Design a protein around this ligand. Structure first.
Ligand SMILES: CCCCCCCC/C=C\CCCCCCCC(=O)OC[C@H](O)CO
Ligand SMILES: CCCCCCCC/C=C\CCCCCCCC(=O)OC[C@H](O)CO
Ligand SMILES: CCCCCCCC/C=C\CCCCCCCC(=O)OC[C@H](O)CO
Ligand SMILES: *C/C=C(C)/C=C/C=C(C)/C=C/C1=C(C)CCCC1(C)C
Ligand SMILES: CCCCCCCC/C=C\CCCCCCCC(=O)O
Ligand SMILES: CCCCCCCC/C=C\CCCCCCCC(=O)O
Ligand SMILES: CCCCCCCC/C=C\CCCCCCCC(=O)O
Ligand SMILES: CCCCCCCC/C=C\CCCCCCCC(=O)O
Ligand SMILES: CCCCCCCC/C=C\CCCCCCCC(=O)O
Ligand SMILES: CCCCCCCC/C=C\CCCCCCCC(=O)O
Ligand SMILES: [Br-]
Ligand SMILES: [Br-]
Ligand SMILES: [Br-]
Ligand SMILES: [Br-]
Ligand SMILES: [Br-]
Length: 262
């Protein structure tokens, strides 16, 4: 009842488009899961955790998207020409809770292919995860107010954005100070990964703000469309680039299975 999805009836076209976005998301992540599983054998031990983390992200995101899809069809029934709310079973909050797990995985696989190790890896991962969790938690509290108190959504969103900015500064600083350690030409690739991240992750706060500028049923559809673009870009496309970097550095480091695969 705290999310705008509960306020509207949906046309068949709107309802089925949202359902198809979510189900397509499930298929894309589980298809990618198999790809990451099969190619892990071509990654040197030093980097193989990075590809395993992509497997974990795929199933984590795939399970939440599948949960959202079933919750969506549980919550609404087609009555008198529109889909109308029947049960309080759908909310976006499950995405936020899941981010607590998937964002640390996405960040860790970046740090691994940057060749960080030992105390710097543990220290950098700790500050990044704390910053990320602060961002997620404040965002989560903010969206509890997207119906009742838009001013509170904005203020919690400003606090969240402060964590986001600091997180991105840590990430960017480590990338630009360590890309010279990267093998096989991937010092060039990692810069593109950073820009892909900036683009894809910024779509989430845009989705967060939809209630402020498009509080209607088409805004609900737009938000799910933005989440879909962002999810595929931040998890699947990002994971493919991380895996490419891992295999390329593995080969440059003399790992034979990587050399043959390329
Ligand atoms: C009264 C309400 C409370 C107000 C306060 C809440 C807002 C504070 C937010 C950010 C400050 C913390 C930023 C400090 C981060 C420094 C540590 C760090 O980033 O280390 C990175 C390094 O590159 C890795 O080794
Ligand atoms: C809540 C409202 C507050 C609004 C606040 C607006 C300030 C935005 C500024 C920067 C965004 C952070 C982007 C981080 C980009 C990476 C920066 C970086 O990596 O620095 C390069 C390094 O110094 C080379 O060695
Ligand atoms: C969802 C689509 C996944 C299928 C193909 C993506 C291929 C993109 C290439 C990503 C880098 C991995 C790579 O090039 O090496 C793997 C090779 O297939 C070792 O047999
Ligand atoms: C796969 C999911 C990912 C990469 C989720 C990323 C989420 C964010 C970057 C969220 C950022 C937010 C803000 C910067 C302010 C508004 C609240 C959030 C949590 C949506
Ligand atoms: C190889 C693997 C390919 C991808 C595997 C995905 C398999 C099917 C996904 C099932 C999602 C169906 C959810 C429907 C819920 C609903 O809308 O009611
Ligand atoms: C589609 C189902 C799975 C295909 C992956 C199994 C084939 C293993 C190939 C690995 C190799 O070439 O050594
Ligand atoms: C309060 C929350 C703090 C969370 C901190 C999490 C710390 C995680 C630290 C690094 C995990 C990396 C483990 C795998 C190392 C891979 C390196 C390698 O095998 O080449
Ligand atoms: C359990 C999750 C781990 C918590 C540790 C991470 C700490 C990060 C920043 C805390 C942000 C505090 C915001 C809580 C206030 C919300 C409220 O009381 O309404
Ligand atoms: C760490 C968290 C940092 C500070 C969070 C401040 C935002 C609190 C807004 C409360 C709005 C209200 O209840 O009146
Ligand atoms: C996620 C990015 C957050 C950006 C910070 C928000 C910037 C705030 C800008 C002006 C706030 C104006 C407050 C007006 C409250 C409207 C109350 C209402 O109409 O219900
Ligand atoms: Br229709
Ligand atoms: Br329509
Ligand atoms: Br190795
Ligand atoms: Br997720
Ligand atoms: Br490149």
């Amino acid at each position: 009842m705290k999310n705008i999805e509960s306020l509207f009836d949906y046309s068949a076209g709107q309802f089925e488009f949202i359902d198809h976005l979510l189900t397509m998301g499930v298929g894309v992540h589980f298809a990618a899961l198999i790809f990451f599983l099969v190619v892990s054998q071509f990654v040197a031990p030093k980097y193989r955790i990075a590809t395993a983390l992509s497997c974990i992200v795929m199933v984590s995101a795939g399970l939440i998207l599948n949960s959202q899809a079933v919750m969506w069809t549980d919550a609404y029934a087609y009555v008198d020409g529109s889909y109308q709310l029947q049960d309080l079973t759908f909310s976006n909050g499950y995405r936020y809770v899941n981010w607590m797990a998937t964002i640390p995985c996405l960040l860790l696989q970046l740090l691994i292919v940057l060749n960080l190790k030992g105390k710097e890896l543990f220290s950098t991962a700790t500050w990044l995860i704390l910053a990320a969790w602060g961002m997620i938690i404040t965002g989560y509290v903010g969206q509890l107010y997207e119906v009742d108190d838009i001013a509170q959504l904005m203020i919690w969103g400003a606090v969240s954005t402060a964590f986001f900015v600091v997180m991105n500064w840590i990430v960017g600083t480590k990338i630009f100070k360590n890309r010279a350690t990267m093998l096989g030409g991937t010092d060039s690739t990692i810069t593109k990964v950073f820009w892909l991240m900036m683009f894809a992750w910024t779509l989430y706060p845009i989705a967060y703000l939809v209630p402020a500028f498009m509080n209607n049923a088409d805004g609900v559809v737009l938000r799910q469309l933005l989440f879909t673009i962002a999810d595929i870009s931040s998890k699947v496309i990002y994971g493919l680039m991380i895996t490419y970097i891992a295999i390329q550095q593995s080969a440059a480091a003399g790992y034979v299975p990587a050399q043959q695969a390329l």
